[PDB]
Amino acid sequence: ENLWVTVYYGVPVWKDAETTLFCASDAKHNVWATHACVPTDPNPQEIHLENVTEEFNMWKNNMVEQMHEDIISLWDQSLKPCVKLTPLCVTLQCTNVTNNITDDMRGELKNCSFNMTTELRDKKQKVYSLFYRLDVVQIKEYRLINCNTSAITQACPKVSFEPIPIHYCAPAGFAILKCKDKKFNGTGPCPSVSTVQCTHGIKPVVSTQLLLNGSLAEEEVIIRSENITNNAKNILVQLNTPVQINCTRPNNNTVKSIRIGPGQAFYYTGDIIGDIRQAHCNVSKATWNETLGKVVKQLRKHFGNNTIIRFAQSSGGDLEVTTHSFNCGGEFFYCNTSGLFNSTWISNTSVQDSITLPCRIKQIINMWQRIGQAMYAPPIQGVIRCVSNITGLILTRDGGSTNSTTETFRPGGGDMRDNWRSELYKYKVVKIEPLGVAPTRCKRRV
Amino acid sequence: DIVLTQSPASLAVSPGQRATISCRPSESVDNYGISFMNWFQQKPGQPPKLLIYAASNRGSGVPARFTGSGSGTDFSLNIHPMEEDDIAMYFCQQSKEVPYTFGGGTKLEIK
Amino acid sequence: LGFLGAAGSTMGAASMTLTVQARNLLHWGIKQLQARVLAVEHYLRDQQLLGIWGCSGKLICCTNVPWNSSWSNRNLSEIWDNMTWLQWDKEISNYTQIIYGLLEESQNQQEKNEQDLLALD
Amino acid sequence: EVKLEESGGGLVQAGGSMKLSCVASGFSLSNYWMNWVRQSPEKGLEWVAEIRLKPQNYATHYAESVKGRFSISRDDSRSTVYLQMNNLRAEDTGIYYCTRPGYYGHYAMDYWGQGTSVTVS
Ligand SMILES: *[C@@H]1O[C@H](CO)[C@@H](O[C@@H]2O[C@H](CO)[C@@H](O[C@@H]3O[C@H](CO)[C@@H](O)[C@H](O[C@H]4O[C@H](CO)[C@@H](O)[C@H](O)[C@@H]4O)[C@@H]3O)[C@H](O)[C@H]2NC(C)=O)[C@H](O)[C@H]1NC(C)=O
Ligand SMILES: *[C@@H]1O[C@H](CO)[C@@H](O[C@@H]2O[C@H](CO)[C@@H](O[C@@H]3O[C@H](CO)[C@@H](O)[C@H](O)[C@@H]3O)[C@H](O)[C@H]2NC(C)=O)[C@H](O)[C@H]1NC(C)=O
Ligand SMILES: *[C@@H]1O[C@H](CO)[C@@H](O[C@@H]2O[C@H](CO)[C@@H](O)[C@H](O)[C@H]2NC(C)=O)[C@H](O)[C@H]1NC(C)=O
Ligand SMILES: *[C@@H]1O[C@H](CO)[C@@H](O[C@@H]2O[C@H](CO)[C@@H](O)[C@H](O)[C@H]2NC(C)=O)[C@H](O)[C@H]1NC(C)=O
Ligand SMILES: *[C@@H]1O[C@H](CO)[C@@H](O[C@@H]2O[C@H](CO)[C@@H](O)[C@H](O)[C@H]2NC(C)=O)[C@H](O)[C@H]1NC(C)=O
Ligand SMILES: *[C@@H]1O[C@H](CO)[C@@H](O[C@@H]2O[C@H](CO)[C@@H](O)[C@H](O)[C@H]2NC(C)=O)[C@H](O)[C@H]1NC(C)=O
Ligand SMILES: *[C@@H]1O[C@H](CO)[C@@H](O[C@@H]2O[C@H](CO)[C@@H](O)[C@H](O)[C@H]2NC(C)=O)[C@H](O)[C@H]1NC(C)=O
Ligand SMILES: *[C@@H]1O[C@H](CO)[C@@H](O[C@@H]2O[C@H](CO)[C@@H](O)[C@H](O)[C@H]2NC(C)=O)[C@H](O)[C@H]1NC(C)=O
Ligand SMILES: *[C@@H]1O[C@H](CO)[C@@H](O[C@@H]2O[C@H](CO)[C@@H](O)[C@H](O)[C@H]2NC(C)=O)[C@H](O)[C@H]1NC(C)=O
Ligand SMILES: *[C@@H]1O[C@H](CO)[C@@H](O[C@@H]2O[C@H](CO)[C@@H](O)[C@H](O)[C@H]2NC(C)=O)[C@H](O)[C@H]1NC(C)=O
Ligand SMILES: *[C@@H]1O[C@H](CO)[C@@H](O)[C@H](O)[C@H]1NC(C)=O
Ligand SMILES: *[C@@H]1O[C@H](CO)[C@@H](O)[C@H](O)[C@H]1NC(C)=O
Ligand SMILES: *[C@@H]1O[C@H](CO)[C@@H](O)[C@H](O)[C@H]1NC(C)=O
Ligand SMILES: *[C@@H]1O[C@H](CO)[C@@H](O)[C@H](O)[C@H]1NC(C)=O
Ligand SMILES: *[C@@H]1O[C@H](CO)[C@@H](O)[C@H](O)[C@H]1NC(C)=O
Ligand SMILES: *[C@@H]1O[C@H](CO)[C@@H](O)[C@H](O)[C@H]1NC(C)=O
Ligand SMILES: *[C@@H]1O[C@H](CO)[C@@H](O)[C@H](O)[C@H]1NC(C)=O
Ligand SMILES: *[C@@H]1O[C@H](CO)[C@@H](O)[C@H](O)[C@H]1NC(C)=O
Ligand SMILES: *[C@@H]1O[C@H](CO)[C@@H](O)[C@H](O)[C@H]1NC(C)=O
Ligand SMILES: *[C@@H]1O[C@H](CO)[C@@H](O)[C@H](O)[C@H]1NC(C)=O
Ligand SMILES: *[C@@H]1O[C@H](CO)[C@@H](O)[C@H](O)[C@H]1NC(C)=O
Ligand SMILES: *[C@@H]1O[C@H](CO)[C@@H](O)[C@H](O)[C@H]1NC(C)=O
Ligand SMILES: *[C@@H]1O[C@H](CO)[C@@H](O)[C@H](O)[C@H]1NC(C)=O
Numbered sequence: 159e160n161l162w163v164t165v166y167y168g169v170p171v172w173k174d175a176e177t178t179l180f181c182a183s184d185a186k187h188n189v190w191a192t193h194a195c196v197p198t199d200p201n202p203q204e205i206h207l208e209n210v211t212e213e214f215n216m217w218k219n220n221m222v223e224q225m226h227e228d229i230i231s232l233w234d235q236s237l238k239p240c241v242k243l244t245p246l247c248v249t250l251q252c253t254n255v256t257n258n259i260t261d262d263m264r265g266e267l268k269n270c271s272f273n274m275t276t277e278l279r280d281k282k283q284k285v286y287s288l289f290y291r292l293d294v295v296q297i298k299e300y301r302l303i304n305c306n307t308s309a310i311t312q313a314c315p316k317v318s319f320e321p322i323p324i325h326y327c328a329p330a331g332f333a334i335l336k337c338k339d340k341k342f343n344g345t346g347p348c349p350s351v352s353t354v355q356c357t358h359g360i361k362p363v364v365s366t367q368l369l370l371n372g373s374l375a376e377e378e379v380i381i382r383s384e385n386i387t388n389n390a391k392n393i394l395v396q397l398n399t400p401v402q403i404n405c406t407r408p409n410n411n412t413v414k415s416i417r418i419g420p421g422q423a424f425y426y427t428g429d430i431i432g433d434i435r436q437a438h439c440n441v442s443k444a445t446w447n448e449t450l451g452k453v454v455k456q457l458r459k460h461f462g463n464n465t466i467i468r469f470a471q472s473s474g475g476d477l478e479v480t481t482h483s484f485n486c487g488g489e490f491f492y493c494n495t496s497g498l499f500n501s502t503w504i505s506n507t508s509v510q511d512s513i514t515l516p517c518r519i520k521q522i523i524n525m526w527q528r529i530g531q532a533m534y535a536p537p538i539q540g541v542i543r544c545v546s547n548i549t550g551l552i553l554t555r556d557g558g559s560t561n562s563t564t565e566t567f568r569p570g571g572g573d574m575r576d577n578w579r580s581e582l583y584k585y586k587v588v589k590i591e592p593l594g595v596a597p598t599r600c601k602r603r604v
Numbered sequence: 605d606i607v608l609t610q611s612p613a614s615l616a617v618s619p620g621q622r623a624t625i626s627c628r629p630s631e632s633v634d635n636y637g638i639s640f641m642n643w644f645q646q647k648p649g650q651p652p653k654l655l656i657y658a659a660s661n662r663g664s665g666v667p668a669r670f671t672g673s674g675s676g677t678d679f680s681l682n683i684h685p686m687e688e689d690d691i692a693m694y695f696c697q698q699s700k701e702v703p704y705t706f707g708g709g710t711k712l713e714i715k
Numbered sequence: 716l717g718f719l720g721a722a723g724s725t726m727g728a729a730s731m732t733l734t735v736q737a738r739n740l741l742h743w744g745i746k747q748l749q750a751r752v753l754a755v756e757h758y759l760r761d762q763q764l765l766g767i768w769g770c771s772g773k774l775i776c777c778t779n780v781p782w783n784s785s786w787s788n789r790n791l792s793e794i795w796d797n798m799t800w801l802q803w804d805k806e807i808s809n810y811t812q813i814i815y816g817l818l819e820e821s822q823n824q825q826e827k828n829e830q831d832l833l834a835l836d
Numbered sequence: 837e838v839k840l841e842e843s844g845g846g847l848v849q850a851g852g853s854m855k856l857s858c859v860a861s862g863f864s865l866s867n868y869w870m871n872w873v874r875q876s877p878e879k880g881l882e883w884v885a886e887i888r889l890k891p892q893n894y895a896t897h898y899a900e901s902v903k904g905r906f907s908i909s910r911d912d913s914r915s916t917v918y919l920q921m922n923n924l925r926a927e928d929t930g931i932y933y934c935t936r937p938g939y940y941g942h943y944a945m946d947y948w949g950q951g952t953s954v955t956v957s
Contacts, residue, residue, distance in 0.1 A: 161782035161791060166784035167765065167774050168733030168740075170722040171804050178746050194743050208723030209799070231742070329750045330741055331757060333719065353719055386891045450718055462869050462889045464937040466636070502636060504941030509636055535739055560888050560895040561702065563943055592740055593806060595814055596726070597791055604826055605900075635903070642944045651933055651948035652881065658942050682840035688847075696880055699943040703899050 161597040164171060168592050172333065175314035176220045179326040179334075181228065182356065187317045189236040190230065190362055191324050198325050202356045207335070210351040214337050216272035216344035216583035217384045219325070225578050229362055230526055241312045243534055246354040247305035248272040252289075255434075262436045266518075270300065274424075277417055287418055287426035292477075292520040303522050306533045310522065315425060315536045319488050321371070323359025328587070337588045341375075342384045344583045360581045364525065366483045367472075367495055369550035369576040372580050374398055382583075386460065389558040392570040394580060395456075400547035401449050405439040405486055405493075405517070425536040427478045437517040439493055441548075446498060446513060448581045453551070455502050466564040469499040470556070478527065479572040481518070486544035490535055493517040495569060527572070550580060606631045608698050610708030611632050616715035622684040625710050627696040632677050633659065635700055642697040643672065646709075652695065656681070688714055726803060727795040733774045768818050769826070780817050786810045838862040840934045845952030852956075853922035858934035858949060859915065866890075866912040869937050872919050873945065874954075875929035881941050884932075885919065902928075924956045 182199070186190035225507045252270040271286040294300050305308065328334050334357060337348035375398040385395045412428035454467055461467075471494075472480040481492040493515050502509045521535050554570040570576075605612045613677035617623045633640040647650040659679050660672040669674055669690070670693040673680045691714060696707030718739055721732040722833070741758055762771060770776035787806055794803065807814075839861040848854050858870075872885045887907040888895040896908050907920040917934065931951045938946025 161784075162780055163778050163780040163818060165765070165768060165770050165776050165778065166730070166733065166762075167770075168736040169800050170719050170729055170732065170736055172719075172722075172801050180747070203717075205717035205720055207719055210801075211722055273821040329754055330739070331754045387893045458940075459867050460889075461891050462867060463940055463941050464869050466941045504636070504638070506940070509795050532691070550790070556737075560892040561897075563699075563941070590736075590740065591804075592736060593764070594800065595807070595811070596803075597787070597794065598777075599791065602777045602779055604779075604829060623933050638941075640942070642942075644945070649949060652945065653948075654938070654946050657944045658937050660943070663939075663944075663946070693880075697944070702897050704883045704943075706881040706883070709856075 159198075159599055161599055162601065164596045164598045164600060166594050166596060168401075169594040171591050172588040173591055175332070175587065177332050177587060177589070179221065179224060179327055179328060179587070182325045182327055183322055184359075185322045187314075188322060189233055189317055189319055190322045191232050192322050193235075194228075194232065194305060195324065198359075199327070199356055202325075202358075204336075204352050204354050206338075206350075206352045211347045212282065212335055212351050212586065213346065214335075214342070214344070214348050214586050216382075216579055218241060219579070219582055219586070221582050221585060221587065222575055222578050225326075225360075226575055233525065236317060237311055237313065237533065239313045241418075241424070243310045243312050243424065245275045245418060246310065246424070248274075250289075250300040252294070252300050255288075256309060257430060257434050258432070260436075261434065263291075263302075267434065268294060268300075269425065270294070274416060275418055277420060278308060279362050283416065285426075287414075288428070288430070290519055290521060292518060293522050304532050308530050310322050310532050310534050312424065312534045313488075313536060319321060319485055321361040321363050321397045325356045325359050325363050327356040332587060332589055335573075335588060337584050337586075340377060341380060342583075343380065345382075345581075351586055357582075357585055360578075364483065364485060364574065364577070365568035366479060366481070367552055368482055368548050369394075369396075369545050369552070369572070369577060369580055370484075370548060372549040372577075374400065374549055379452050381453075381456050381460060389555045391554075392573070392576055393553045393555070393567075394576060395453060395551040396580065397449065397548070397550055398452070399449065400549060401441065401445050403439055403441050403546055403548060405437075405484060405491065405544045405546075406436045407487075407489065407491075407519070408435045409437075410541055411537055411539065413537050413539045427537040433444065437491060437519060439515045441498065441513045441515070443511055443513050447508070448501075450501065450508075451506065455506070461565060464563060466502065466504055468502045468564065468566045470566055470568050471496040471499055472568050473556070475572075477518075478522075484517075484544070487538050487542040489519060489542060490521075490523050491517045491519055499567075499569060552576060606698055606701060606705055608696055608705045608707050610696050610710055612710060613708065614711040614713070616713050617683075617686045618715040619638055619687065619715075620685045620690060622682060623686050623690070624680060624682055625694055625712070626678075626680040627707055628658055629677050629679075629698055633698050633700050634676065639675060639679070640698065640700040641668075641672075643681055644695045644697065646693045646695070647691075657677075683712070686712075686714070722799065722801060724799070725796055726798055726800050729800055737774065751817070764815070767823060769823055778815075778818055778822055780822050783810075787813075838936070840936070840947065840949030842932070842934050842949045842952040845932070845954050847955045847957065848924055850926055850956050852924055853920075854954070856919040856921070856932055856952065856954070858917040858919075859951060860917065861915070863865055865910070865915045865917070870910065870917050871935045871945070872908065872932065873935055874928075874930045874932045875951075876944075887917070892937070926956050928954065929956050930954060 174358045179193045181191050183195040184190045250270050252268045255267050255269050273282045274285045276283050295303050333353050336352050338350040339348045377398045380396045383391050385391050410431045414428040415425045417423045482495050484491040552570040553567045556568045557566040609628040641659040643656040644652040645655050655666050656672045671682050694710045695709050698705050721729040765771040841859040844856040859940045873883050884899050884902045886897045887908045910917045933951040934949040935945045936947040937943045
């Protein structure tokens with residue numbers, strides 16, 4: 159008959175919105191969020207939302223920006239108690255190196271000495287220490303790298319850099335939606351959606367050109383990008399298998415220290431015991447060979463058949479983006495990935511045991527590529543061994559060719575937000591709106 | 605454009621004898637150490653059929669009697685034994701570059 | 716029928732769960748405090764709006780404001796049995812402010828006056 | 837089993853226009869490159885057009901002999917390929933074929949449709 163306005167409250171309707179999510183962790187000193195975080199839900203509840211086709215868009219996901227800002231802020235807070243090395247910027251005369259040497263790139267290791275300050279304002283002390291070539295620039299007389307651009311802070315020796323899984327949880331009135339659909343490319347409608355109070359834990363792993371210790375694709379290698387036609391964009395590749403990599407530093411370095419001023423001390427590399435050798439990483443050849451074949455097959459689906467796919471090392475740019483960054487034992491390594499990407503594919507096999515890559519060590523680093531800031535890592539005593547799994551790749555189109563039967567890819571990197579996206583693409587945040595109206599016929603007495 | 609020369613314009617071959625057809629690209633088909641010449645067979649009333657790819661690899665369903673040869677700018681097709689079933693036009697193709705080009709369409713017949 | 720499990724169901728079926736939904740509506744220190752404060756202000760504003768409508772004591776209520784036939788060209792039983800609340804909210808999204816204003820203006824303004832006369836007697 | 841079916845052929849007056857079509861079957865069109873060639877006893881085989889996939893921005897290429905008078909396009913949602921032509925010349929008379937590049941890194945016309953006659957006068 160006559161339809162009337164009715165009011166309902168508690169109606170299950172939501173709208174897209176951004177809100178701050180709060181971190182939680184199962185985790186004693188560490189640079190990571192564990193100090194800011196609260197205890198986790200050990201078994202987060204998941205409720206499937208049936209008959210829901212909610213759209214996801216990882217490229218517009220603001221959770222990425224929140225994660226990035228929190229990680230940087232935490233990194234900085236961990237350094238505020240730590241020792242400043244301003245007195246360290248000195249003449250640094252160097253005398254080459256003497257030992258039982260199998261060496262490295264020639265001149266990679268340097269023996270240097272200087273006048274360092276002491277506990278009393280009235281006195282100075284003569285010291286010597288070893289430096290890597292990357293740490294020192296010639297003015298013989300030398301200058302510590304970046305003394306002419308920034309202050310250098312020593313990382314605290316007692317604080318771990320080991321990744322800690324971080325969970326993110328919604329505030330009341332908000333919910334986190336998760337896409338369960340297999341082989342999702344990160345955009346468009348998701349066929350299967352569920353609601354969780356919190357995300358699965360995400361580790362703050364930092365690496366370049368290759369993604370380490372991330373999640374694996376459930377069935378097949380997944381290739382995604384913001385704009386497949388734009389050569390500028392990075393292409394993220396998620397593997398459905400791990401590839402194990404064995405990295406080591408054989409040199410048996412020793413550690414010595416000097417008290418500087420009343421409140422602080424400086425740590426430096428001492429004499430090296432035994433033969434001096436190049437740092438390196440071992441990747442299984444058979445495993446890598448299979449892995450590339452899986453990636454190539456998926457590339458062909460996107461770029462079509464009848465294409466010759468070639469891989470190559472980066473053509474240029476700084477060490478920070480042209481090599482693979484690691485953090486193992488607190489030492490920072492830069493490894494040359496050439497030989498992993500050195501191939502051409504035609505017949506679903508290459509046209510042509512293990513692969514060993516050379517690595518370099520640098521003590522002066524800038525993790526977020528910020529201008530005017532730098533950190534000095536302390537030396538780690540003894541031999542380092544580190545084994546990890548490669549879980550994905552960052553590739554860019556180099557040739558971009560449409561005028562030929564060929565295409566060439568090279569490793570990408572330098573933008574950390576793309577690492578965060580490899581885990582966060584699954585999630586979306588929405589706001590709950592409980593109020594609504596309907597026509598149902600009814601009346602109310604006055 | 606790359607000019608693909610093919611000869612003879614035609615040849616008659618007696619049964620059981622070897623046929624030979626040659627092609628001379630103005631620029632080599634080779635790339636990545638691999639030849640890019642294709643060979644096709646055609647009969648009236650039908651579309652062309654691929655017999656050889658990469659100047660040496662027989663296609664699916666292709667009998668042993670057909671073989672490719674050569675490298676650089678000098679390639680040839682050798683058919684043996686010749687049979688009536690092999691009477692056809694034959695074409696070379698250069699797949700290395702756009703535009704793709706075709707050969708002379710040499711006629712092979714029984715003598 | 717867990718939290719928001721109702722969203723997949725048709726509008727009529729969803730009414731079974733309104734209580735379930737209601738239960739879930741309610742440097743670093745700044746982020747924590749601002750999130751909590753904003754959640755509270757939003758919560759209170761919805762209750763204030765119901766209080767203006769006179770429906771603050773109920774999850775479900777009826778009003779005496781007539782439905783405009785132009786707001787949606789659908790049958791009543793069609794809406795309740797053939798649609799989800801997510802779909803329904805989109806179809807009338809252009810008219811929500813109009814309906815809210817009518818509830819406040821066209822009905823509750825009159826009832827308060829009649830009640831004053833009855834109470835006066 | 838891969839099949840290609842040509843259509844839209846026939847006699848057209850010179851200076852006129854027509855559209856040829858090819859129906860893909862047995863394979864995913866969206867995952868594959870497509871090509872057109874033509875034949876005449878006067879000339880033998882001649883390549884005329886190629887069309888690329890989405891990462892390639894659907895770029896197209898034409899032989900100089902047909903460029904600017906011919907256009908190639910595809911509809912991935914219908915599994916079809918079209919060849920549009922205009923400003924037709926008697927020189928364009930011949931048999932047109934829908935083709936597929938086949939073997940990888942060894943681009944070759946592994947598959948052909950039956951083709952269709954086009955006559956210009
Ligand atoms: C990706 O994850 C894998 C799996 O976790 C990881 O491989 C493992 O890394 C951990 C951490 O480096 C290794 O655990 C080490 O074990 C040695 C044993 O001698 C400990 O000494 C290490 O440090 C402890 O002891 C130090 C003594 O000075 C303390 O200072 C320090 O704070 C620790 O208490 C540490 O526990 C583990 O053995 C490997 N697993 C292997 C090699 O199979 C991999 O490294 C991760 N990848 C990346 C890039 O992080
Ligand atoms: C990841 O996959 C999703 C689908 O699961 C992609 O969304 C869909 O992409 C296709 C191809 O672009 C869209 O098809 C359309 O074709 C018409 C022409 O027929 C064209 O005009 C449109 O612009 C579009 O290309 C399809 O509509 C689209 N679906 C939705 C809901 O938008 C998504 O693009 C993929 N992401 C990447 C980076 O490839
Ligand atoms: C501080 O010194 C470094 C070198 O130690 C300067 O970096 C150099 O800049 C020149 C000019 O562009 C390059 O040719 C050198 O190759 C750079 N050296 C290195 C190691 O990259 C840096 O510019 C100086 N900073 C300031 C503010 O002058
Ligand atoms: C680096 O050079 C210094 C200076 O030559 C070496 O230290 C010297 O070692 C000899 C032998 O014990 C002493 O006689 C000198 O007095 C030391 N010089 C000092 C303490 O200033 C140092 O051993 C060298 N390091 C390496 C790894 O060879
Ligand atoms: C990476 O591979 C190289 C080459 O196999 C390893 O070098 C060998 O190390 C073993 C250690 O017992 C020696 O016995 C071999 O003689 C070495 N081979 C050489 C020098 O050619 C290297 O140890 C591997 N790295 C890791 C971390 O396993
Ligand atoms: C990296 O090191 C690990 C050991 O830490 C290697 O795994 C072992 O490999 C040997 C054979 O070389 C097996 O006998 C052991 O049983 C393995 N240990 C396991 C499986 O726990 C691994 O192969 C090395 N990776 C590379 C690429 O050399
Ligand atoms: C990774 O290593 C390869 C060599 O294995 C480097 O290639 C050489 O780079 C130098 C740079 O001065 C060139 O002079 C050489 O001609 C290159 N060799 C070849 C064969 O091309 C490559 O540059 C290294 N990558 C990085 C980022 O350092
Ligand atoms: C990339 O791969 C090529 C091919 O393997 C490498 O070139 C080869 O270098 C070795 C050195 O002993 C020669 O024996 C081969 O004949 C070369 N192959 C050629 C020329 O086709 C090249 O050095 C690799 N680049 C690296 C490792 O940076
Ligand atoms: C890549 O191509 C090769 C050559 O066609 C494939 O090798 C053949 O695969 C078929 C089907 O499994 C087998 O029946 C043949 O015996 C294989 N020939 C061999 C092993 O010499 C190969 O399987 C293809 N790879 C993929 C992943 O499809
Ligand atoms: C693109 O190339 C692949 C190569 O595998 C084609 O895959 C064919 O897959 C079917 C089974 O689905 C096999 O019977 C064929 O033998 C495969 N062909 C070859 C040459 O390996 C695929 O069909 C090609 N294009 C499309 C659209 O599938
Ligand atoms: C989806 O709707 C169907 C009726 O079309 C209903 O049976 C089902 O419960 C809904 N969602 C489910 C079953 O997960
Ligand atoms: C080490 O000696 C080499 C000899 O070539 C020289 O080139 C290099 O500069 C030296 N390294 C130093 C002094 O750090
Ligand atoms: C370095 O090599 C010399 C021989 O050249 C040897 O006598 C000396 O002991 C070695 N030093 C070591 C192994 O520490
Ligand atoms: C310390 O400074 C004095 C200044 O005369 C210099 O002679 C001496 O070599 C310096 N010691 C070093 C650099 O180790
Ligand atoms: C990719 O970049 C091209 C550049 O022409 C643009 O036309 C296209 O819209 C982009 N695709 C997107 C943003 O999805
Ligand atoms: C490394 O140095 C330590 C110092 O205590 C020594 O015990 C160990 O044997 C050395 N390792 C070698 C020489 O391989
Ligand atoms: C990689 O594996 C393929 C088989 O999947 C093999 O044919 C090829 O020779 C391998 N490449 C090597 C061992 O370098
Ligand atoms: C990756 O490496 C870590 C650390 O060794 C290990 O715990 C995890 O199981 C590995 N993932 C695999 C092997 O899939
Ligand atoms: C194709 O050629 C044009 C110039 O004619 C060039 O600008 C283009 O980069 C080439 N390929 C692509 C993908 O741009
Ligand atoms: C119903 O809507 C029409 C416009 O479609 C409007 O003219 C009319 O005044 C409305 N009736 C009300 C608001 O009572
Ligand atoms: C509403 O019901 C009428 C019959 O009263 C029917 O004719 C019409 O199709 C219905 N409208 C719908 C289902 O949208
Ligand atoms: C709702 O009505 C439409 C009318 O086309 C029908 O197709 C659909 O199946 C109906 N949904 C139901 C009955 O759940
Ligand atoms: C609601 O407003 C939007 C504005 O884009 C319009 O497209 C849509 O048709 C409107 N709905 C109705 C029922 O008028």
